[PDB]
From Swiss-Prot:
From-to range in the entire protein, with total length: 38 to 92 of 422
Species whose genome carries this gene: Homo sapiens
Posttranslational mods: Phosphorylated by AMPK.
Function: Component of the 26S proteasome, a multiprotein complex involved in the ATP-dependent degradation of ubiquitinated proteins. This complex plays a key role in the maintenance of protein homeostasis by removing misfolded or damaged proteins, which could impair cellular functions, and by removing proteins whose functions are no longer required. Therefore, the proteasome participates in numerous cellular processes, including cell cycle progression, apoptosis, or DNA damage repair. In the complex, PSMD11 is required for proteasome assembly.
Family per record: Belongs to the proteasome subunit S9 family.
Protein location: Nucleus; Cytoplasm, Cytosol
Expression sites (tissue/organ): Highly expressed in embryonic stem cells (ESCs). Expression decreases as ESCs differentiate.
Protein name per UniProt: 26S proteasome non-ATPase regulatory subunit 11
Assembly notes: Component of the 19S proteasome regulatory particle complex. The 26S proteasome consists of a 20S core particle (CP) and two 19S regulatory subunits (RP). The regulatory particle is made of a lid composed of 9 subunits including PSMD11, a base containing 6 ATPases and few additional components.
Induction of the gene: By FOXO4; expression in embryonic stem cells (ESCs) is mediated by FOXO4.
Amino acid sequence: NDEEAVQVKEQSILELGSLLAKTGQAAELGGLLKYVRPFLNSISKAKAARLVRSL
């Protein structure tokens, strides 16, 4: 279903954000929170707020 695609997409956001945190990227990782702005509206505010606090 779509929930699994959102789950693997979120773990791909933690994965790509982890690799960008390992490579020492600042503008890309800082702009990723602005890039995932429309994606956070497709799910609840709990996982969105937890992702904003995590990143």
